[PDB]
Structures are given as C-alpha cells and as structure tokens.
C-alpha cells in the first residue's frame, strides 16, 4: 500500500522527470536488455541496437503508462485496467521480468535525479513500481 508520503515522493520525483520520461523509459529498457538478456525474448523482432527508433518509441509507451499511473495514483487498478488486460491476455510476460524492468527504471532515475533520489524517495519509487507491476499481472489467472 502506498502511504501519503509515498505518493508525495513519487509525484515529486516523476514531476522532476517531466518531459524526459519517454527518454528515461527508453534508457531503462536498454539497461534491461543489456543487464538481463533473457528479457530480449519478448522483443524478438525489435531493433534493439543502441539508440534505435523502436526502443525510443517503446520507451515512450512505457513512460506514458507510468505517467498515467502517477496521475491516478489513488485509482491505479482502474487507470491501468486496459493495459492490465493486454498484459494478461496477450503479452503474458513472466512476472519475474517486472522486477527487472523496475530495477532498471530505478537505476535510470538514480542516474538522472541526484538531488531527489533520497533513500526515502527510493523506497517510495520501489513500492510504486512494485504496485504498478502487481496490477499488470493481477489478471494472469
């Protein structure tokens, strides 16, 4: 469960991310593909080379969804319902992979938010990403 402080922390952090969200999304995916190669099995036909347009286009998609969840932090199961249907009925990515992307999103935020990535903000962001993941895999079975 996200506390009043968690919500204040992630809104502050993501707000600082502002217009770079799409870019950070792409960087998190590139970090994930490099650190955990098995995740590439879900993007067999993508151009995964550095700076490729597909990965940038996909980082945007991931970032917009996260931005939407932050905007509706008090109603995420509903705000992410459509995306959650897609994950459970089509993408069907194994649950373990959400922790990998989450970790990589944390690393990316850490590398771009020196001032705001405090231990408290880090705890909040980690809970937030775990919560988004939980929703996205809540209809698997």
């Amino acid at each position: 469960v996200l506390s009043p402080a968690d919500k204040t922390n992630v809104k502050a952090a993501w707000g600082k991310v502002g217009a770079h969200a799409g870019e950070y999304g792409a960087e998190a995916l590139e970090r994930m593909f490099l650190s955990f190669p098995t995740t590439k099995t879900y993007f067999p036909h993508f151009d995964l080379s550095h700076g490729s347009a597909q990965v940038k286009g996909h980082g945007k998609k991931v970032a917009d969804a996260l931005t939407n969840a932050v905007a509706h932090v008090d109603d995420m199961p509903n705000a992410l319902s459509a995306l959650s249907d897609l994950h459970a009925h089509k993408l069907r990515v194994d649950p373990v992979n959400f922790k990998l992307l989450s970790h990589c999103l944390l690393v990316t935020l850490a590398a771009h938010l020196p001032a705001e990535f405090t231990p408290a903000v880090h705890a909040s962001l980690d809970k937030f990403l775990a919560s988004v993941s939980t929703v996205l895999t809540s209809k698997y079975r």
Binding site: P37, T38, T41, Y42, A88, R92, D94, V96, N97, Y140
Partner: protein, 145 residues
C-alpha cells in the same frame, strides 16, 4: 551438486517413469496452472479449459517429446550443460522462450512425480529432483545471449 546417493535415488525412480504420460501430464498442468505459458502454443487448438488442455493431443504429443529430451538428459547428470547446449540455442534464437519457463515446468514436473509416486516421493528424493530440474533449467538457459 548431486551426491552419489542422490544420483542413485534419481536414477532408480526415473527408471520407473512412463515418460510419455508424465511429459503430457507435466506440459498439460503447466498450461492449466500458469495459463500465460500458453502464449507459446497458440497453434495447438482448444486450450479453453483444463480438460481441453489435458486431453489436447497436441499438448500430450509435445509433452512426450520435451520430457523425452529431459529423460535423455538424466543419463548425463555430470554434463547437463553440454547435453542441452543445442536445445538451449534453439529455445533462445528460434523459439524465444524466457528461461523462467524452464523453472516453472520443473516444479510442475516435481508435482507430477509426487502425484504419481505418492509416499515413495520422499523428502530426500524430492530434494535430489529439485537439484535436477534446476540443473536442467540452468543448462537450457546457458546459451542465451
């Protein structure tokens, strides 16, 4: 790794396994218990219900083959990496199967062995089989890149 006594324990139990049945059974349950794994078998037909999945001839046939490869692997417990090297590159480069799936099938398989053998599937026998399924899963994941 496996101790001499564990290898013996694994080999003697496996010698009484009907690989055709257990493989169909194991693959079937994987698809019923973790339905998202069906993502790799869309061309198999009806998988709308547990009974459809279990009695689905394409599921049983595929299960037989997979555990058949797994069975052969049990004869080379000292070199699981080399033995599955070919199947490893295949599942990565051609099938694009996330290795996590190997671990899920391993536990389902452990559940099936337990279901079938009953009390004979003792705690020490399970421990030895946990090592095997983990070893095979790691072997099948070794050539990924």
């Amino acid at each position: 790794h496996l101790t001499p006594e564990e290898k013996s324990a694994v080999t003697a139990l496996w010698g009484k396994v009907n690989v055709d049945e257990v493989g169909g059974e194991a693959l079937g349950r994987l698809l019923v218990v973790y339905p998202w794994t069906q993502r790799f078998f869309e061309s198999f037909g009806d998988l709308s219900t547990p009974d459809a999945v279990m009695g689905n001839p394409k599921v049983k046939a595929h299960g037989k083959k997979v555990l058949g490869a797994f069975s052969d692997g049990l004869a080379h417990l000292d070199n699981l990496k080399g033995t599955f090297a070919t199947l490893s590159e295949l599942h990565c480069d051609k099938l694009h199967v996330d290795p996590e799936n190997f671990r899920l099938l391993g536990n389902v398989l452990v559940c099936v062995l337990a279901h079938h053998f009953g009390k004979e599937f003792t705690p020490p026998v399970q421990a030895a089989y946990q090592k095997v399924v983990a070893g095979v899963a790691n072997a099948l994941a070794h050539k990924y890149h």
